[PDB]
């Protein structure tokens, strides 16, 4: 099937309920995190740790420089 991309590309309102992760290599901790896809693609081998499930949007995909590797381009 398709290759799932960053949940930011499908977050149609500001937030969406989902599992999300911390990346200590990128110091994206606390209130900052990444979706299930970006933990596996953009932060592969990047000292990832489960955060929680809840209301969230992905800070990897949202980054304005477009450096997320899991966007539609
Ligand atoms: Zn993402
Ligand atoms: Zn990282
Ligand atoms: Zn990403």
Residue numbers in the entry: 1657 to 1729
Sentences from the study reporting this entry:
Our findings suggest that the UBR box of UBR4 recognizes type-1 N-terminal arginine and type-2 N-terminal amino acids containing an aromatic ring, such as tyrosine, tryptophan, and phenylalanine through pi-interaction with two phenylalanines of the UBR box of UBR4.
First, we determined the ligand-free structure of UBR4UBR. The structure of UBR4UBR, like other UBR boxes, is composed of three α-helices and two antiparallel β-sheets. The UBR4UBR coordinates three zinc ions. However, whereas two zinc ions (Zn2 and Zn3) were coordinated by six cysteines and one histidine in the structure of the UBR boxes of UBR1 and UBR2, two zinc ions were coordinated by seven cysteines in UBR4UBR. Besides differences in the residues coordinating zinc, there was also a structural difference between UBR4UBR and the UBR boxes of UBR1 and UBR2. The carboxyl group of Asp1715 and the oxygen atom between Phe1713 were conserved at the same positions in the structure of UBR4UBR as in the UBR box of UBR2. However, in the structure of UBR4UBR, there is a unique feature where the aspartic acid residue (Asp1721), which is one of the main features of N-recognins such as UBR1 and UBR2, is located far away from the ligand-binding site. In other words, in UBR4UBR, Asp1721 may not be involved in ligand-binding unlike other the UBR boxes of UBR1 and UBR2.
